[PDB]
Amino acid sequence: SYDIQAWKKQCEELLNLIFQCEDSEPFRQPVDLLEYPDYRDIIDTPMDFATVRETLEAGNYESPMELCKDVRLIFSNSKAYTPSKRSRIYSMSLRLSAFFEEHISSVLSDYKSALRFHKRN
Ligand SMILES: O=C(NC[C@H]1CCCO1)N1CCN(C(=O)c2cccs2)CC1
């Protein structure tokens, strides 16, 4: 299964699944500083799933590893901003992270395999 390009549509489909998850609700658009006035005191690099989807559709990711780094940033930002490990939005982030990691592991594997096949000679 050595298609170097196949990761892109696989990531589009996984983002569609994440947008259907009720657990993505807090993470679907950049945080609003009116409601969370100190957010940018704590978080140096905001990230959200609409930004990830737009970057993918612009042709601004070279690899699924770069997409994976931005999606992991969504979850690290929620862990850094939460006042409690028992918070509602942090708890949603942990379930969504588990779902994402379960689905991205074949996308990464297949891509890295396809690039090794391309370099085989
Ligand atoms: O404002 C947003 N998200 C956009 C809105 C738009 C309507 C739904 O979501 N967020 C999500 C990320 N935050 C967190 O991870 C945490 C808050 C408390 C503990 S962690 C901050 C609040």
From Swiss-Prot:
It is found in: Nucleus. The modification Phosphothreonine is found at T45. Residues 2-107 form the Bromo domain. Expressed in myeloma and epidermoid carcinoma cell lines. The modification Phosphoserine is found at S1, S91. Probable regulator of the insulin and insulin-like growth factor signaling pathways. Stimulates cell proliferation through regulation of cyclin transcription and has an anti-apoptotic activity through AKT1 phosphorylation and activation. Plays a role in the regulation of cell morphology and cytoskeletal organization. Interacts with IRS1 and IRS2. Interacts (via bromo domain) with acetylated lysine residues on histone H1.4, histone H3 and H4 (in vitro). It is linked to Chung-Jansen syndrome: An autosomal dominant disorder characterized by developmental delay, intellectual disability, autistic features, anxiety, hypotonia, obesity, and dysmorphic features. This is PH-interacting protein.
